Subunit: 466 residues, 4 copies
Amino acid sequence: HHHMAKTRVETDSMGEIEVPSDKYWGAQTERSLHHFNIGKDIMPREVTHAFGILKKAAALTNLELGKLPKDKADLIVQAAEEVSKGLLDEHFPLHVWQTGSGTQSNMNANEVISNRAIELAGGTLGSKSPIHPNDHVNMSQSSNDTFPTAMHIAAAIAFNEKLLPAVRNLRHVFAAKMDAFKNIIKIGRTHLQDAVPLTLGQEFSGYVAQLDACVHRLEEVLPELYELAAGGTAVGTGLNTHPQFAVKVAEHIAKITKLPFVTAPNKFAALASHEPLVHAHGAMKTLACALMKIANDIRWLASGPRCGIGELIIPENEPGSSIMPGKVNPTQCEAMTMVCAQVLGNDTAVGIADSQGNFELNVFKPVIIFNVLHSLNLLADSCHSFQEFCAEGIEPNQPVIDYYLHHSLMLVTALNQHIGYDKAAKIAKTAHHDNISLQEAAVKLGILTAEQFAEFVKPEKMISPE
Amino acid sequence: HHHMAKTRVETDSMGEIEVPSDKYWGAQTERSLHHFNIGKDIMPREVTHAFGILKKAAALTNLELGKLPKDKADLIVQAAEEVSKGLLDEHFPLHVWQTGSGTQSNMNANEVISNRAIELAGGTLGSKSPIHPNDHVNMSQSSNDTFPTAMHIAAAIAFNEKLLPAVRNLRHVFAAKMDAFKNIIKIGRTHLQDAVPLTLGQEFSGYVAQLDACVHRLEEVLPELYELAAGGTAVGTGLNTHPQFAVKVAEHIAKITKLPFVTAPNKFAALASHEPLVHAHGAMKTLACALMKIANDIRWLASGPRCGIGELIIPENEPGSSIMPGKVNPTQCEAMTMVCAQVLGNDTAVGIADSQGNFELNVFKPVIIFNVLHSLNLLADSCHSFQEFCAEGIEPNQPVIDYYLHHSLMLVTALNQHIGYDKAAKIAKTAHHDNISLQEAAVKLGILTAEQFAEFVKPEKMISPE
Amino acid sequence: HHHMAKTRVETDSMGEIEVPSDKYWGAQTERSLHHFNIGKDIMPREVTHAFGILKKAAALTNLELGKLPKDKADLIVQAAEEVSKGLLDEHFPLHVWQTGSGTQSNMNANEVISNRAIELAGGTLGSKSPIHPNDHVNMSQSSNDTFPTAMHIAAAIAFNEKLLPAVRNLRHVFAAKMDAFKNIIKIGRTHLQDAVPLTLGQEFSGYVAQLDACVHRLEEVLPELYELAAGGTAVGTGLNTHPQFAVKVAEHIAKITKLPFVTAPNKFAALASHEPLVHAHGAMKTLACALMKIANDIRWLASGPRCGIGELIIPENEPGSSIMPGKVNPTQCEAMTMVCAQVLGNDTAVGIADSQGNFELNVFKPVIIFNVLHSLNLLADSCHSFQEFCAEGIEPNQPVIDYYLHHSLMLVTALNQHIGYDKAAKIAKTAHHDNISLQEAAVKLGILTAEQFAEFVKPEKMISPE
Amino acid sequence: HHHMAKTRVETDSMGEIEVPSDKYWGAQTERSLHHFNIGKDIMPREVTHAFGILKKAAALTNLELGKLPKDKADLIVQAAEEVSKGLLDEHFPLHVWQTGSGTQSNMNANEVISNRAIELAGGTLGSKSPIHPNDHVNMSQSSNDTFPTAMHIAAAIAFNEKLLPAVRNLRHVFAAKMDAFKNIIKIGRTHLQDAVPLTLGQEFSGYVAQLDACVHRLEEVLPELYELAAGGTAVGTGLNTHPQFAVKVAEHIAKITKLPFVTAPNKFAALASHEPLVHAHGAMKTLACALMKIANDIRWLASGPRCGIGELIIPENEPGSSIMPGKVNPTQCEAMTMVCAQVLGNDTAVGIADSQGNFELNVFKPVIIFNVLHSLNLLADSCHSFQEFCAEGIEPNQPVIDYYLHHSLMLVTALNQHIGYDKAAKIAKTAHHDNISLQEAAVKLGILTAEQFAEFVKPEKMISPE
């Protein structure tokens, strides 16, 4: 192994290893990079930032418990704050496809925070003095209860700060369009066939209701994620931690994040299984199922400009051609529906990985959180992009909407109570056979005048019960 | 088409069709059987029974609204009660793989209830008099808002009466075993490797906590399922139903079932999408992920009798061989883990089908409810079978548990505070090299007497924090 | 346990058990029914029939090897032939969710064939004389190498006799429509937007090519399925079978079926894993992905009759209403697309189950073959139904096809070489702005006469390279 | 929008846009980055390199057809060679979650190759002179037939050069271990229970056979991938390309790659669907199912060091602790099994995306190739890492293997032919009851001497047929 850049010597129990001088990680992170260079997927930075939160909270807890000297605590807190702010993300090189407990990324956090703290103290990086990655930064913690804590911190923060606001904000654009479109009457479509009318606002209200329900399902995940594994140590018993550490470290994490993190009531389930994250992903899967449908309705309704449906007009954002006026490819719908297919696959992966726990520890932890955060960021980013570059600009093509409404055969049942089923069916059959409107067929057959037809067939009286 | 058995003539708008005389379905059910003979999967009987509930509630509602005469209402209610009790299930022959709105099974219910009601009145089956399948049994309803109502009734009743009790009951067997095993100390296993100890009760407490969380996730689905589509009619607007029908029919369904069914606040989402059923299935998927792990722990811990782990003993229920004493194949674990694999696949199918709605109607309704009820019955039945024939009979193999506890190298860290890390590591290395116990190595090296070892290494002091 | 019907006493190593007198199964099948009453799914009858084939072949082999007397062989062959013909399927009551090796269904076959053979000999059912279910019907076989042999026999026969012919036959209907439609020019659609033209025959040729490729992928599975596990006995070594049994029994199975069954070259992989069946299901998944798209194109192109696309007309098979002329719901497309969603979920289940083998035996065998045969029958049946009741009757709506072709803006690039890009773009922009055709805009602007437009814009010259 | 770095002005039909001066992409790539900033996933570099191959081949073809001047061809070829060698990968910033046709990445290739070619000619970047991204680099190509060509080139090259060699090489390490272990007799395990013996070589032969079959399934994909969409242009007809372009460009791609690329016989299926890539992913899924099982056998057999199975010893690669001798966590098995879970989820995503084609174009192309290449690289990299750091170092723990072999009860059936079933069963029952070996029980009961037992029970005579 070699590095073009200058290196320093670090040590672990396997001996010396050279580490790039401008990086803060240590011997074990460097050594592990050599053995787990699988794929391109770097551990998600939300997990790195959550490790910063955990290590800060641990230092404050160990200080309060009298275990960690104030001067060492202050240095660790300062470095862990930089980690949690994302300022040291280039020092976290490990891939997802690592130790299944995530211990390697826990040690990456310990080594980075130790070496940055050593630098803040004016010491020699790699010397483990005055801040030792295991003895100080990992004090009262274990190889097994740290990564699952980072998983739940990362997922809960991302739900609250990124995903739920993105879905709420898209819902309120659809609601604003719903209100704008509340008096536009359009033809229904069931089984893809022409059907009785509804307003464009009513149809958009379905999307609003779908998104409302998804918001609620995502919120219902959060209490499970607020429960933290920290304090279970190696197998769940808390052996070799302080009797107060589990509760106090969660108290500090709650204070740091202003979210109601608590210690997990059952540490054995918290280490041996990850159904809270299966549930988090399942709620995201329900959102992908709703978004697939909503995005598909928008692109089908806007299809054209002349040989599709064409009831809606969407904004064009990629360059067009002056020789192709009216043509708009629905590229935000395409990105969103591709995201939705990915989320349904990621949901399969998460459930498979969760099902594979053995005894005291599920060792599929990195792939579980990787898929949760991948789906979350894809969904949130696509909601935001689809909102800005498609949904906010949706407009009705009123002449097309109106054409379908008054040229469909489906309004004919408004005639039954006036002329009877037989005469109404005759009007519809003649309209269909002669390729004319219901009104034109009624006049042609001498059954109704045009004024009688307009009195009897009022679409605004066909969008609610009697 | 032909029937060995005597037939009667029925009619629909395509003409005459012969229907077996001893069956209550009518022309459209018979005719559809000829076009949708796909697979072997008959529509689940819970859906049939829910149609009975809906049609009874509809008749009572239409009677109260003055639309349906009392004599016709009474006959429909009587026949619909037989349907809801399962007494007419042989008259529902249609397969899952039918019209994607489920309208064919709605018409199966209308025809059966009409012909049975005609028989109760002493009339001629097939005559549609005095009870017409469309004009009376389907009064105020539509082809599109009836099957989704049956879906939610069936799923909510099955959750409440079958699945949730089965999971609760399995949880309490594991809790009773947890209590029985609370003082049995065993070796932990992490990454499949020997680890620090925990009690067998603590390990079973993890399973108890997993099942508790699953119960809660399944309960959280129910409010979505209690909302019913009935009253949305063809496209969600309620055109061609009574303005009070949606609310009153749900009131009657709630009274019949003693569950809090209500009309859906948004009929457009209720017809165009089925995320409540995606969510119902997702919660079942979390249960499958937990059960896979629990069942696998039980069969691995009981593996043997001599060359596996062997900490547990499970009951034998299939015949054994007197020449193979001690051997027990974990067949309830095998059936359960196969069920869990099926549920994870069914969850993929449900999300795909839900994602495929278009405009005013999702027309994947039968496959969605088919998978929900299939997974539900597999999970509930396997919980019950695994409980009765495996979990209730789990016993510890105390000599094997004890052997591992005192022959593992992992208890050596109890020595550090007395003799130091170096001497403790020397004891462990000698034990490993010489294939002897930690106590034997400590004595062999002259570092500890046996009495000193027993004083310093107390597994009962190694299962909690300091 | 009890039975309304008369019973006889049977015995196994757990004692006496009552078995219905009119059923041919024995003690172990009855006893197992009491422990594995999970779900409704009875082991697929193709597996039962394949057990008949295996047991006939085994009897002929054991006769040839001198192990089985001729009189006993003849009786077993006669009963096993009845099993393989489906004549005894009501005597196979066990569910899929059984012993994960499938040994319970192997014993169901042994007991049925033994008791039917005893009856043919005039003996006492349940006495195991003169035909013993284990000592004669299971002679030279094991509990573990029999069900996987039945799996491969069932799957290979079903591929050859049912699935592949169904797909080939649907392909040739689409090819016949392709030929009929080869001169009908229609507008292309890309991203759902209007695009340059192609013939309806060219578009159908895509479906033909998709089905051809699927046929090839399904055929490529077969050599893996022809390799049989029989002869591996308990763990793959062949301990306790005749050195010639594995090869000779496969020779007899090949002769019975007229398919090239052979003994598996590696019995350890044949018992410990089932990737041939994962591959069989994966090829079916590719067919589901193609059929979803083909069925969706057909229903979208036929959507209407007036407010959708409407380029195609499909046959109506469920009763319509004289007041709704022209309306045809695409119910065969709906059943097919629901089947396709199911197959994608079943594919997830099969891969999960296959991944879960341990050591010498994968004990997820029933769920693997259950999903393979479920997907196979759904796909084959839906192909046949969709062919008969939809594809064979597809017709073009030529006036609608022609309207789109000549009212799209996309043909304008045919003008560039005659009038230049600028004038062509001006024609398109005016057509779009004024809601008129390209020809009308060209005339309106004085750029072209109508005769010049017709000379320059020839759709029949726009469906191939220069 | 802004850039800290110096920028140049580029133009598209939407106007001016600033592009970083040190980047080779152009207006449309920059503008699209602003609209499709979804997730972190950059289009896989294999697709970028394949675009280099396509654009080189296109330039050579257009030169041969007389359409492209030699001086412009030479410049494009030079720049496209740099792209195909990976030398310009920092100039391809677009994400997977883009236009569903992949046209945006096609234009990224055109703009990079144009601007690099302009630089090679000494011109002004952004001027589109002397090399125009559309008029020259995209000459004879379309927005829709280019990305699918890159998909197939990338996948076929990656199969041949990376995935298949990685699987073959892992197979031959397992085969070398198989040969080394051919005389080591161990206890079988079925259903996780002790079973009759087999050699460790026989058990490893199962893994070898599984990998051989997977190699064959992966090879069988390749003929589908060698067929290329290039030449189908917008909808499959080849409108607006040269009649010889499709065949000649594939000829040039075959010459460049030394792989047998050919033009696709049906361009409509090639644009409208992607079952070749579903099949490619399905074959990778079969490999994930095999690897999950193989990796699990290795980690279970090596579990310990004292309270698991412990028949194998694996190398330790992460630092251990001198106080935990003998303990080795199976971290390569963990990374591999996590990869396998990911591949099963990715397979679900690929099938869903492929099923969603409409009319002339499937617009899920980026997510399909993203998952194919993600799964491929994870599988190939994990095979290589698992080979180097686990499989090559697998050793038997012969004392543990031997202990199980001679202390299992399963060898007792070797006694039946000498002492009868009854006496053999008595020996087994006494051994089990008294916790002693079969030999000790036989002696204790006075049934056999130790020498008689050793003569009658020879494990080397128990691993094959009579």
